[PDB]
């Protein structure tokens, strides 16, 4: 096991943090821990909606949580309903100005954390792991993407000898920093144990 995490490798170049705020030595942890408590609760409920990106902003005792998602309707609710019932739930933990937005995802197939999340689902439903991956890539590419690669490790089909299977199409220059790589990881539970799903999407370079 050798390769670098291709997100953290690109911070400050092609990818930007999901927590953009300042704090001094004596306060940093307490806020960061809240983002931790928040992101869990959000992804506990919003997993259904098709959660893509959890952005958090701060100033002083107030915070704007910009959530990206593939079904904005399941997030917002009945006429402003669900998105409300979370605002209260949100400021219960936060104890502060919980401004909770919901943003469009102009294609789940160009969203790496989504492509993965779906494959993690398909194999929870006893589906052909090889075929499912070639499909996952085949979707992403048909939506004009420049390149794609998808990886599943674990007891495929229940096999006793664990195996890592993978597939790819186009370009994926993970050594290149001026190239945009969206990466998303999805962990699939089953009866025989857990498998892991890695997705890399090459949008295009800068």
């Amino acid at each position: 096991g050798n390769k670098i995490h291709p997100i953290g490798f690109r911070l400050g170049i092609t990818r930007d943090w999901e927590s953009r705020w300042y704090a001094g030595k004596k306060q940093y942890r307490h806020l960061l821990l809240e983002d931790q408590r928040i992101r869990g609760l959000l992804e506990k409920e919003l997993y259904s909606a098709g959660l893509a990106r959890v952005d958090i902003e701060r100033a002083a005792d107030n915070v704007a949580v910009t959530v990206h998602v593939a079904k904005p309707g399941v997030v917002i609710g009945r006429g402003g309903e669900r998105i409300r019932v979370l605002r209260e739930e949100l400021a219960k933990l936060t104890g502060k100005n919980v401004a909770l937005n919901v943003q469009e995802v102009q294609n789940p197939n160009l969203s790496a954390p989504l492509v993965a999340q779906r494959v993690a689902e398909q194999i929870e439903r006893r589906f052909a792991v090889r075929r499912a991956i070639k499909q996952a890539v085949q979707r992403v590419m048909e939506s004009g993407a420049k390149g794609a690669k998808v990886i599943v490790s674990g007891r495929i089909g229940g096999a006793e000898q664990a195996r890592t299977e993978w597939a790819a199409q186009g370009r994926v220059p993970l050594h290149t920093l001026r190239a945009n790589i969206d990466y998303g990881f999805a962990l699939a539970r089953t009866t025989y144990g857990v498998l892991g799903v890695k997705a890399y999407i090459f949008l295009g370079e800068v």
Binding site: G12, R20, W21, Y22, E57, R58, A59
Partner: protein
């Protein structure tokens, strides 16, 4: 008369460090420029894997860049309009006299 500007990302510090200085340069009168103070750096070094493997670490850094601007000749037209400024999230300000 003093403005202090502090953030984690400098490209948004210099945006806001210029923007505040343009404002007071508008509504009168003296701007002693955006003087970039030395950055205070806290490095984090850590063994990569979860178990053993001591001879392989990774280096992380945290840059708390500093800025200072001096609006010298006040003109309280500045005292109202600064109270309304568009300073992005990742940045702190401290105001003195």
């Amino acid at each position: 008369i003093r403005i202090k500007l502090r953030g984690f990302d400098h490209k948004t510090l210099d945006a806001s460090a210029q923007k505040i200085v343009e404002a007071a340069r508008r509504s009168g009168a003296q701007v002693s420029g955006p003087i970039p103070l030395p950055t205070r750096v806290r490095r984090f070094t850590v063994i990569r894997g979860p178990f053993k493997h001591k001879d392989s670490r990774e280096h992380f850094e945290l840059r708390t860049h500093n800025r200072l601007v001096d609006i010298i000749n006040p003109n309280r037209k500045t005292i109202e309009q600064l109270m309304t400024l568009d300073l992005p999230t990742g940045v702190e300000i401290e105001i003195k006299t």
